[PDB]
Swiss-Prot record:
Subunit structure: May form homohexamers. Interacts with N protein.
Domain Macro: 1-170
Membrane-protein topology: Multi-pass membrane protein
Lineage: Viruses, Riboviria, Orthornavirae, Pisuviricota, Pisoniviricetes
Coiled coil regions in record: none
Catalytic reaction(s) noted: Thiol-dependent hydrolysis of ester, thioester, amide, peptide and isopeptide bonds formed by the C-terminal Gly of ubiquitin (a 76-residue protein attached to proteins as an intracellular targeting signal)
Compartments where located: Host endoplasmic reticulum membrane
Physiological role: Responsible for the cleavages located at the N-terminus of the replicase polyprotein. Participates together with nsp4 in the assembly of virally-induced cytoplasmic double-membrane vesicles necessary for viral replication. Antagonizes innate immune induction of type I interferon by blocking the phosphorylation, dimerization and subsequent nuclear translocation of host IRF3. Also prevents host NF-kappa-B signaling. In addition, PL-PRO possesses a deubiquitinating/deISGylating activity and processes both 'Lys-48'- and 'Lys-63'-linked polyubiquitin chains from cellular substrates.
Modulation of this protein's activity: Inhibited in vitro by GRL-0617.
Taxonomy, superkingdom: Viruses
Record's protein name: Papain-like protease nsp3
Length: 172
């Protein structure tokens, strides 16, 4: 398990790869895969839709059961559910939806949930549907997370931009 390979090491504990998070999960067999969730665990598009599709909708049914028992998550919060065929566990983390005016500072709270797990395969939280600048999401991750985070960025042009931007900011 946790057989990560081909990552670029950004810091002592943050790694990045140009890869689809679902294909990485199948390759790596991680203990924890992170979902970029919303408070009602309605896994539609982006990472949540991709993860859910790869579980043949089991992650959505499990999430429906969770919500019916526990109610919606809070923004910046998380829950640990099954990783189904992709991982031992899925950590569902809710970044702020910047497009709806939710506090961008809650992206720090969101990434703080990573610190409860020794190693994670994760996406850039809030950087898609939720409208945060991906460069900002990466900076918050690097600054907030102390545990080992392996970031999967599927789009090559974004990957290239993130790496070059990270280098410029790291040295200045
Ligand atoms: C809930 O709204 P969020 O903004 O928190 O989350 P989301 O829309 O999923 O996007 C979060 C970031 O992961 C990127 N991304 C989308 N699909 C994949 C995938 N299969 N593998 C890897 N990365 C992906 C997306 O392009 C964005 O950079």
């Amino acid at each position: 398990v946790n057989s990560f390979s081909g990552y670029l090491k950004l810091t002592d504990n943050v790694y990045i790869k140009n890869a689809d998070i679902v294909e990485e999960a199948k390759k790596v067999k991680p203990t924890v895969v992170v979902n970029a969730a919303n408070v009602y665990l309605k896994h539609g598009g982006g990472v949540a839709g991709a993860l859910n599709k790869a579980t043949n909708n089991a992650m959505q049914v499990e999430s429906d059961d969770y919500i019916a028992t526990n109610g919606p998550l809070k923004v910046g919060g998380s829950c640990v559910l099954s990783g189904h065929n992709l991982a031992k566990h899925c950590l569902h983390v809710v970044g702020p939806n910047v497009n709806k005016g939710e506090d961008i500072q809650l992206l720090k709270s969101a990434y703080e949930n990573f610190n409860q797990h020794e190693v994670l395969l994760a996406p850039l939280l809030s950087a898609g549907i939720f409208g945060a600048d991906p460069i900002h999401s990466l900076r918050v991750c690097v600054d907030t997370v102390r545990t080992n985070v392996y970031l999967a960025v599927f789009d090559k042009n974004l990957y290239d931009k993130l790496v070059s931007s990270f280098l410029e900011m790291k040295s200045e």
